Amino acid sequence: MRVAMISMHTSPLQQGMNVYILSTATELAKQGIEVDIYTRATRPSQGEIVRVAENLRVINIAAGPYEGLSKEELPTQLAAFTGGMLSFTRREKVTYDLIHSHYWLSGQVGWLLRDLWRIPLIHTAHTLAAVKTPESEARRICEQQLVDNADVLAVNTQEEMQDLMHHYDADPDRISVVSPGADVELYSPGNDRATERSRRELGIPLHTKVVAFVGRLQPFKGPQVLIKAVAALFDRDPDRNLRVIICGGPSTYRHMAEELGVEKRIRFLDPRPPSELVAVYRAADIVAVPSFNESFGLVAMEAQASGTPVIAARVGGLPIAVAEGETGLLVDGHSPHAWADALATLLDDDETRIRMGEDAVEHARTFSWAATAAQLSSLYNDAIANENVDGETHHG
Amino acid sequence: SHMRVAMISMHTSPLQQGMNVYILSTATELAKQGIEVDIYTRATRPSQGEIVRVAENLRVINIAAGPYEGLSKEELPTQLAAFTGGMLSFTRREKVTYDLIHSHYWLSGQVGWLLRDLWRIPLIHTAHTLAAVKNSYDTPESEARRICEQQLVDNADVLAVNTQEEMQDLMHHYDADPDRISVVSPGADVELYSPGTERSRRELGIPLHTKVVAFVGRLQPFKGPQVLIKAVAALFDRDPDRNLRVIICGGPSDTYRHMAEELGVEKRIRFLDPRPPSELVAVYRAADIVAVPSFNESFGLVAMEAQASGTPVIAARVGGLPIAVAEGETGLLVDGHSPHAWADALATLLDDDETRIRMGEDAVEHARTFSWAATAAQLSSLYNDAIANENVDGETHHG
Numbered sequence: 001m002r003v004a005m006i007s008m009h010t011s012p013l014q015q016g017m018n019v020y021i022l023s024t025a026t027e028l029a030k031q032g033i034e035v036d037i038y039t040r041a042t043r044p045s046q047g048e049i050v051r052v053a054e055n056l057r058v059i060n061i062a063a064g065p066y067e068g069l070s071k072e073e074l075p076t077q078l079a080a081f082t083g084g085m086l087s088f089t090r091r092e093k094v095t096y097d098l099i100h101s102h103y104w105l106s107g108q109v110g111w112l113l114r115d116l117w118r119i120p121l122i123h124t125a126h127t128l129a130a131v132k133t134p135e136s137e138a139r140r141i142c143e144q145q146l147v148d149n150a151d152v153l154a155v156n157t158q159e160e161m162q163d164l165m166h167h168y169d170a171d172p173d174r175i176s177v178v179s180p181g182a183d184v185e186l187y188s189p190g191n192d193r194a195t196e197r198s199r200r201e202l203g204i205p206l207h208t209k210v211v212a213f214v215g216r217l218q219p220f221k222g223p224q225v226l227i228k229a230v231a232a233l234f235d236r237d238p239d240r241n242l243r244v245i246i247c248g249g250p251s252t253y254r255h256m257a258e259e260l261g262v263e264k265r266i267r268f269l270d271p272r273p274p275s276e277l278v279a280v281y282r283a284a285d286i287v288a289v290p291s292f293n294e295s296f297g298l299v300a301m302e303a304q305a306s307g308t309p310v311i312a313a314r315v316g317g318l319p320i321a322v323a324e325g326e327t328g329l330l331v332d333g334h335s336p337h338a339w340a341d342a343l344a345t346l347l348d349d350d351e352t353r354i355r356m357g358e359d360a361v362e363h364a365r366t367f368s369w370a371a372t373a374a375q376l377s378s379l380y381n382d383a384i385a386n387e388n389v390d391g392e393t394h395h396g
Numbered sequence: 397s398h399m400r401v402a403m404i405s406m407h408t409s410p411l412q413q414g415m416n417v418y419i420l421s422t423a424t425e426l427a428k429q430g431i432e433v434d435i436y437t438r439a440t441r442p443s444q445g446e447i448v449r450v451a452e453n454l455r456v457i458n459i460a461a462g463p464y465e466g467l468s469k470e471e472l473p474t475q476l477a478a479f480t481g482g483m484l485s486f487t488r489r490e491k492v493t494y495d496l497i498h499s500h501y502w503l504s505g506q507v508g509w510l511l512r513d514l515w516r517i518p519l520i521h522t523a524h525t526l527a528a529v530k531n532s533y534d535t536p537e538s539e540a541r542r543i544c545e546q547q548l549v550d551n552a553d554v555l556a557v558n559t560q561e562e563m564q565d566l567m568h569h570y571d572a573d574p575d576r577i578s579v580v581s582p583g584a585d586v587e588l589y590s591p592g593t594e595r596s597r598r599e600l601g602i603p604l605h606t607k608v609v610a611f612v613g614r615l616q617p618f619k620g621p622q623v624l625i626k627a628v629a630a631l632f633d634r635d636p637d638r639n640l641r642v643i644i645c646g647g648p649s650d651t652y653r654h655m656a657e658e659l660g661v662e663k664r665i666r667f668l669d670p671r672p673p674s675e676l677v678a679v680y681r682a683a684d685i686v687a688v689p690s691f692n693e694s695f696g697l698v699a700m701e702a703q704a705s706g707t708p709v710i711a712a713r714v715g716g717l718p719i720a721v722a723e724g725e726t727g728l729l730v731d732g733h734s735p736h737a738w739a740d741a742l743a744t745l746l747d748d749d750e751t752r753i754r755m756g757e758d759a760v761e762h763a764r765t766f767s768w769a770a771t772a773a774q775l776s777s778l779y780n781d782a783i784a785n786e787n788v789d790g791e792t793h794h795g
Contacts, residue, residue, distance in 0.1 A: 041795075062795035064543050073540035075473035076506075079480055080547055080795050083510040087793035108474075112481040116514070138471035141462050145478060394485035396439075396460035396478050 001380060002034045004096040004113070006106035008081055009074050011039045013050065013058055017126045020180055021102055027373030029055035033380075036094070038085055040077065042066050048088075061085055072135060074105055082109050086116075098380050100154075102126060104139055107146040114151070115391040120383035122376075123150040124178075125160075130167035144168055148395045152383050154178045154376075176379055181369035182301035186274055187281060189307030189361060198282035202245070209242045209347050212284035212308075214277065214299045215291075218251035222290030222313065222334060227253060229290075229339030231260035236340065242347065245269055247280050281306035285353065286346050289318065290334060296371065297321030304328070305364035309356035311342045317371060327360040400432040401779065402494045402511075404504035406479055407472050409437040411448060411456055415524045418582055419500055425772030427453035431779075434492070436483050438475070440464050446486070459483055470537065472503055480507045484514075496779050498556075500524060502541060505548040512553070513790045518782040521552040522580070523562075528569035546570055550794045554782050556580045556775075580774050583767030584700035588673055589680060591706030591760060596681035600643070600668075607639045607746050610683035610707075612676065612698050613690075616649035620689030620712065620733060625652060627689075627738030629659040634739065639746060645679050646670040680705035684752065685745050688717060689733060695770060696720030703727070704763035708755035710741050716770055726759040 005025055012022040025035040034055045041048075041060035050058040063081035064074075089095070100122040101110030107123045114121035129140040147153065147168040153175045155161050161177060164170035189195070199206055211230070215221045223246060230244055242265065246253070249271035257263040269280065281287065287303035287310045294300075294316035301321050303310050310328035312318040322328040329342050346353045403423055410420040423433045432453045439446075439458035448456040461479035487493075498520045499508030505521045512519035527534070527542040534542075549555065549570040555577045557563050563579060566572035597604050609628070613619045621644060628642055642661075644652065647670035656662040668679065680686065686702035686709045693715040700720050702709050709727035711717040721727045730741045745752045 062793075064540075064547075064795070069540065069543070070536060073536055075476065076537075076540040076544050078473065078476040079506040079510045080544070082477055082480070083513055084793050084795040086510070086513060087791055091791045108477040112477045112484070115481055115484060134468060134471050138462075138467065138474040141467070142474055142478070145462075390488070392485055392489045394460075394482050396462070396482040 001098070001377075001384075002094075002096045003028065003036070003380065004099045004110075005035055005037045006085075006099060006101040006110050006113075007037055007039045007103070008077075008106045008109055009040065009071055009103060011042060011058070011060075012037050013039075013043075013046070013052075017102060019183075019185075020124075020126070023181060023369040024373055024376055025056055026053060027369045028376060029053055030370070031373060031377060033377060036096075038088075040064070040074075040081060059085075059088060061088060075138075078105065078108055082112055085109070085113065097384060098122065100124070100376070100380075101146075101150075104129075104142045104146060107150065108142055111146065111149055114389060115394070118389045118391060120151040120380075120387050120389065121149075122152045122154055122379065122383060124154045124156075125164075128163060128167065131163050145396065150174070151387075151389075152176055152379060154379065156180055178375045178379065179296045179298060179372060181372045182298060182305045182364055183274060184305045184365050184368060187278060187302045187305035187364070189357075190282065195282050198279040201279050202283050204243060204245075204283055207241065209240065210284045211242070211244045211286050211288055211343065211347075212280055212303075213244070213246040213288055214248075214280060214303070215289075216249050216251055217246070217253055220292045221294075222292055223253055224256060225290035225313075225334045225336070225339055226288050227257055227262065227266060228260065228336035229288075229343060230266060231262045232336045232340040233343060234262055234265065236344075240347075243267065245280060245284070247271065247277070277302070278306065281308050284308045285357075286311055286343065288339070288343070289313065290331070290339060291315055291318065292334065294318050300328075301364050301368040304360035305368065307357045307361050309346060309353055309360055311339075311346065320371060321367070323359070323363050327356050327363045397780075399430075399779070400493070400495050401426065401434070402483075402497050402508075403433060403435040404483075404497065404499040404508050405435055405437045405501075406475075406504045406507060407438065407469050407501060409440060409456065409458075410435050411437075411441075411444065411450075415500055417585075417587075418522070418524070421583060421768040422772055422775060423454055424451060425768045426775060427451050428769075429772065429776060431776065434494075438462070438472075438479060457483075457486060459486060473540075476503065476506055480510055483507070483511070496520065496783060498522070498775075498779075499548075499552075502527075502544045502548060505552065506544055509548065509551055512788060513793065516786075516788045516790055518553040518779075518786050518788065519551075520554045520556055520778065520782060521548050522556045522558075523548070523566075526565060526569065529565050547795065552576070553786070553788070554578055554778060556778065558582055578774075578778050580778065581695045581697060581771060583769070583771045584697060584704045584763055585673065586704045586764050586767060588677060589701045589704035589763070590677075591681065591756075593681045596678040599678045600682050602641065602643070602682055606641050608641050608643060608683050609685050609687055609742060609746075610643045610645070610679055610702075611687050611689075612645050612679060612702070613688070614649060615644070615647055615652055618691045620691060621652055622655060623689035623712075623733050623735070623738055624687050625656055625659065625661065625665065626735035627687075627742060628665060629661050630735045630739040631742060632661060632664065634743070640664065642666065643668055643679060643683065645676070676701070677705065680707050683707050684756075685710055685727075685742065687738070687742070688712065689730070689738060690714055690717065691733065693717050699727075700763050700767040700770075703759035704767065706756045706760045708745065708752060708759055710738075710745065719770060720766070722758070722762050722766075726755050726762045 041062045061084035063077040099110045101107045244266040247269040289312040297317045314330040439460045459482040461475040497508045499505040642665040645668035656665045688711040696716040713729040723729045
């Protein structure tokens, strides 16, 4: 398979959308899919073709000056950049099986090219005018055109799908949820003092053992499994120097915790943004993920990227997200006893647990965006299998 | 010869009532020659539908790209790819193949540039206005537009301009290669230049029973204003008491007042400062005859403006003038440039009120039918040369 990704207004080669595009493309290429990322040329020294990795290139198209053309003026270069892409493809004798365009400017480019090339257009908006003037009204119109014309609308979340339905009357049948990987730059162990800093912020002594839960507080994410497992641990041996932190949004669990006499061992933390969530993962010795359903396992990968080993239920994408015996453990089912057993084993074996947290970082870096790319590759194959483009239907 | 042209006019429809007139007038005249022209524009009026049949060989294609109203010219760049894609979709549904593209104004040129590469056919581009000429040492968006106009200067196969001044403007501001520039002269503005004359003679202080001869043009020898002056001296030699006054308008390359003084006719000849087209209507209207004693005259625009105004023309039998003037119907044609031939021709029309007035009336339809005809004739030549010398690889793209 040969994929043309389009990122007109921003190069994936500078240090959210940039890392999404680079990471997914890098991971697709690892799988043997050829990806060319097309971007406007901005850096004379890069040349036209940047060979990034096996199967992965960035193509720099001249359309307007290298500098001095702002994002707001980039619509003027829509046709020129499209023509520049086409001219490249002719000089180079390259053909593609599918286009994945990113942000509305690239969608507009990709829409023209999908008709010409007679191949599917996958489109990811990243941000939307209706979720955020004559400028913004013009952008919204273009985003609506992509809603009404692209073959697949790829969104990051269920919320994004809902924003497309509400604001753009998008057909839910054309929407596919493709979950991004863990932000491995944000979620990192930090320096030698970083875990100390996190503990201090949260008011937790350095010597205490900490188990954390992160996620929406609803029964299919199993926070009740953790709570009941903690009660069982304390029933077995009340002397644990153990605290639990649960973060933390409603879809009750404290009522549950006090019923079981563990409400002074489990603190509920309010949901917080990613930059604040790093401290939770860092302060934790173990992250427990007792999901009944888990497509994906983003929390598990955020925890591992942060250097914290994971005890996960053996469900969904969790056996992939956690390297069993290397970066954490997998639990069969959801009994409080089996969860207490796994927790005790990692809590009492410091040497193994610490090594697992250290190994978790490189595991996340190699494997978090890899599951996003498997989703994309699956979605691409389906779009191609079901491809009918005659270039005649154009809802302008 | 079998020929089909796509004209591109994204931001403005030929079907409403500047560029509009040029596009519709050139397309219409080209269609009369048996060239099939489709003018592509953004859809703005549901009632028109997709395809408008204007005349035999002439269609307007309305392409949906954004809302039919509420999208200003300034936000139109956001629809560049959508409109190009929409054009392409129409061509696939309709199964129509083109031989040449003629784009108008930078937005359409950008569309035409992509397509000319895809189809490997020439792009002829008319700017009509330019950011660098309008503005001067501007905003982020005037700058973006200028860059796009510069791309078209550096990529289009032919740059068609209205005048020599526009050619110079392209050379100065955009470093345009003069070998890629062709001057294509627009036809006479037959709305502005129309008969409506008493009011004109009051405006110009011409009283009022008198017979008047006007000259309009650059006051340089290849336009022959000296020929008229010497012809007028000869007339007054024949009849010291003749009917006649002369108005010369105007603009240096005062040779000619001193010349009129030398020949003893300075009182019967008046020199008017050049003026805008608005003001120039009055001079054509005040005149009974317009004299065009050119030695060189590619086009005959003054002749056509005079005719449109309902004033018959006496012209030298040179260049584009025997086409511009219907000889013996809307004026006279003079062989050579002797004062005596010119005095003969003047006297023939001054002394025959009935034929002169009839010629003036016939002149109006002649202009309204024939002025953009010469424009479309040079376009057809230009289009043929562009196709004969076509060299579009689809690969060279100076973005």
